[PDB]
C-alpha cells in the first residue's frame, strides 16, 4: 500500500533496488547492478510497517537477498534493516549484514557489516 | 578500581584476555592465544564505567586491540563493546567489530561482526 516505498531506488554505488510494497506489509522485488544485466539480478523479499506512526517517525522495514540466480551462486545472503523517510528527498537509511556459508572453523569471518543509503534519484 | 574486572578472562575459543581495571576507568592489558606464546600476544587498551549503577545493571566497557606486535602485522584492529556481569559466574558479554585496512574499492569487506563471552574459568 506504501506507494511511497514502491518504486526504483538507487544506493551510492549505483545498485538498483526495485520493490513493490504490498498493502499487507510485504516487500517483493529485485536487486541488481549499475550495468543491470540479467546476470546481476537477484530476487528479494522483506516486510515493512504498513501502519507507521504519524508523528514524523520513519517507516521500519527490512529485506533479504540470497546471492543465487541462474548465472551465479555466491553462497551468501544479505539482510538490510532500516527505515523509509519520505518527503521531497525521500530516502531509505539501512544497515546490512552479509553472511557467507562457512565451515565451522571459518565461522569467524562469516559476517560482514555495513550501511547503505537509497534515494529515488540516480547517483 | 574494579577488582571484579581485573584478572584473567577466557572466551569460548581458549583466547586469554588479561586486564587491569584502573581506578580512573582505564583498562590496560594483553590479549593472546590458547597456546599463549609471545608471538600471539597483543596489547589492549580500553575504558569502563568506574561508577556503575547499583540496581543490578552490568558494567559497560570496551577495548581495542590493533593486530600488530613484533612478530606479525595483520593490518587490522578489533574493538569489543559489552558489559561485565559480576557474581558467582561472572562474565563479560561482548559484541565485536574487526576492521581490516582495505583499498577504497574493497572497503565493503573491511568489517566483520561477531560476539564473544568471557569467563574466569578456563574452557
Amino acid at each position: 500500500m506504501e506507494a511511497g516505498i514502491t518504486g526504483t531506488w538507487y544506493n551510492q554505488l549505483g545498485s538498483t533496488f526495485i520493490v513493490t510494497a504490498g498493502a499487507d506489509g510485504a516487500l517483493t522485488g529485485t536487486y541488481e547492478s549499475a550495468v543491470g544485466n540479467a546476470e546481476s539480478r537477484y530476487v528479494l523479499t522483506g516486510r515493512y510497517d504498513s501502519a507507521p506512526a504519524t508523528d514524523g517517525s520513519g517507516t521500519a522495514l527490512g529485506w533479504t537477498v540470497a546471492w543465487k540466480n541462474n548465472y551465479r551462486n555466491a553462497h551468501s545472503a544479505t539482510t538490510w534493516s532500516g527505515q523509509y523517510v519520505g518527503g521531497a528527498e525521500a530516502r531509505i537509511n539501512t544497515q546490512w549484514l552479509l553472511t557467507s556459508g562457512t565451515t565451522e572453523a571459518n565461522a569467524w569471518k562469516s559476517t560482514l557489516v555495513g550501511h547503505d543509503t537509497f534515494t529515488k534519484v540516480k547517483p | 578500581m574494579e577488582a571484579g574486572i581485573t584478572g584473567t578472562w577466557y572466551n569460548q575459543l581458549g583466547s586469554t584476555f588479561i586486564v587491569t581495571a584502573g581506578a580512573d576507568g582505564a583498562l590496560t592489558g594483553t590479549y593472546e592465544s590458547a597456546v599463549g606464546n609471545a608471538e600471539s600476544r597483543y596489547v589492549l587498551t580500553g575504558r569502563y564505567d568506574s561508577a556503575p549503577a547499583t540496581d543490578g545493571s552490568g558494567t559497560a566497557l570496551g577495548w581495542t586491540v590493533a593486530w600488530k606486535n613484533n612478530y606479525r602485522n595483520a593490518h587490522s584492529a578489533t574493538t569489543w563493546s559489552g558489559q561485565y556481569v559480576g557474581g558467582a559466574e561472572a562474565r563479560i558479554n561482548t559484541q565485536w567489530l574487526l576492521t581490516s585496512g582495505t583499498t577504497e574499492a574493497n572497503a565493503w569487506k573491511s568489517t566483520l561482526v561477531g560476539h564473544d563471552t568471557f569467563t574466569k574459568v578456563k574452557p
Binding site: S15, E32, A74 | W108
Partner: peptide
C-alpha cells in the same frame, strides 16, 4: 574475491 552485492 568480489561479491555480486558490490559489483553493482
Amino acid at each position: 574475491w568480489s561479491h555480486p552485492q558490490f559489483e553493482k
